[PDB]
């Protein structure tokens, strides 16, 4: 029931060779739906549930406001450069925008900004003011309280952001609700008297997965080293979990995969072997 929306914006000085300087990427519950490029200058849909449920006039309106941010963030890249008294090099302006719909039905809007991998300004909804993190973020706060920015963002994050997020869940009900079964393969390696066992899971949806090693039907937490949930080119996910064991003890070790697609956790062995 937890639904999320994120608008990742990045303004770069060194892209570097043959790469865009400004990019705007949109997300719905983790899945990518919209993308923008500095050389293409057009916001285009990624998934089929968004393109079939929206008009061309919607995307033309979205690309017009995103290209406006491109020119605005280009100015911020030069304005902040003079504030820190820098000439130019490797400087980046990051932007976080969107809202969260909790299980109970509570609004959670956020508007954050960062310079060179460090937090610059964050918007506070319970105080109706912009929070400054660095002493160089003070002239930013002064510009925000001079005009109208705080009132407009509350009317946007609590209403405009939520109203459309509710439609995206309805549009992509079949896509986000769908579950994919991973292809599990149990492997092994020999180095210097150490039998290193590996467990690889290929192409699963959704992102949350619990992969753990089992010796004699007992969970060995501490011992197993994980690589992390890494994504694939087609939107699906992959994971790699490895463990160190004694040579000639490969058969008594088994990989346990816990996923939403499976009704019960699957136990996989090397000699079994894997799938199916």
């Amino acid at each position: 029931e937890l639904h999320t929306l994120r608008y990742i914006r990045t303004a770069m000085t060194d892209p570097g060779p043959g790469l865009p300087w400004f990019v705007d990427v949109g997300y719905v519950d983790g899945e990518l739906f919209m993308h923008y490029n500095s050389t293409a200058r057009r916001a285009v849909p990624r998934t089929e549930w968004i393109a079939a449920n929206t008009d061309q006039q919607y995307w033309d309106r979205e690309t017009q406001i995103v290209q406006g941010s491109e020119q605005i963030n280009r100015e911020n890249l030069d304005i902040l450069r003079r504030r820190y008294n820098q000439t130019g090099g490797s400087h980046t302006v990051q932007w976080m925008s969107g809202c969260d719909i909790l299980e109970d039905g509570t609004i959670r809007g956020y508007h954050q900004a960062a310079y060179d991998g460090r937090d610059f300004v964050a918007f506070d909804k319970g105080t109706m003011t912009l929070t400054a993190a660095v002493p160089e973020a003070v002239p930013t706060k002064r510009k925000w309280e001079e005009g109208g920015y705080a009132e407009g963002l509350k009317q946007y994050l609590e209403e405009t952001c939520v109203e459309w997020l509710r439609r995206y869940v309805e549009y992509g009900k079949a896509e986000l609700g769908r579950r994919e079964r991973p292809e599990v393969r149990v492997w092994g390696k020999e180095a210097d008297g150490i039998l290193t066992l590996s467990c690889r899971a290929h192409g699963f949806y959704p992102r949350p997965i619990v992969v753990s090693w089992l010796k004699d039907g007992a969970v060995r937490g501490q011992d197993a080293q994980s690589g992390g949930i890494v994504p694939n080119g087609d939107g699906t996910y992959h994971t790699w979990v490895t463990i160190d064991a004694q040579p000639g003890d490969g058969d008594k070790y088994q990989c346990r995969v816990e996923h939403a697609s499976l009704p019960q956790p699957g136990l996989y062995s090397w000699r079994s072997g894997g799938g199916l």
């Binding site: 406001i65 406006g68 605005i72 100015e75 302006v93 925008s97 900004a113 920015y149 946007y156 109203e163």
Partner: peptide
Amino acid sequence: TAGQEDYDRL
């Protein structure tokens, strides 16, 4: 579903 590109002004 974004709004005012003016909120990006620093």
